[PDB]
Design a protein around this ligand. Sequence first.
Ligand code: NAG
Lengths: 49, 48
Amino acid sequence: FKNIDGYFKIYSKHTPIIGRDFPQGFSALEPLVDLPIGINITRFQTLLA
Amino acid sequence: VKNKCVNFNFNGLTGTGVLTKSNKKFLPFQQFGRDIVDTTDAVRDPQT
Ligand SMILES: *[C@@H]1O[C@H](CO)[C@@H](O)[C@H](O)[C@H]1NC(C)=O
């Protein structure tokens, strides 16, 4: 997640594999949605299920 | 038109050259494309 000059930017990439947590193998991140929000953001939090 | 020197105005990108079907791997988000030294080389057709 990046929010330079507003214009909220996100990138995503999915790699299921079978190795352990957070492998060292490389992987690129493709952009998914680029939506121009253009507001002030300092805090960040997640949700659960 | 293809295989002919024409002046193109592709989505505001004005220039002159010859356009032919390419065999690149434009990802869906990719729009403009380029070459090694920073010149627009392969532009995907927005319609087709
Ligand atoms: C109009 O643009 C849409 C968006 O991709 C697509 O259906 C096609 O490029 C155009 N349809 C025409 C010219 O009939």
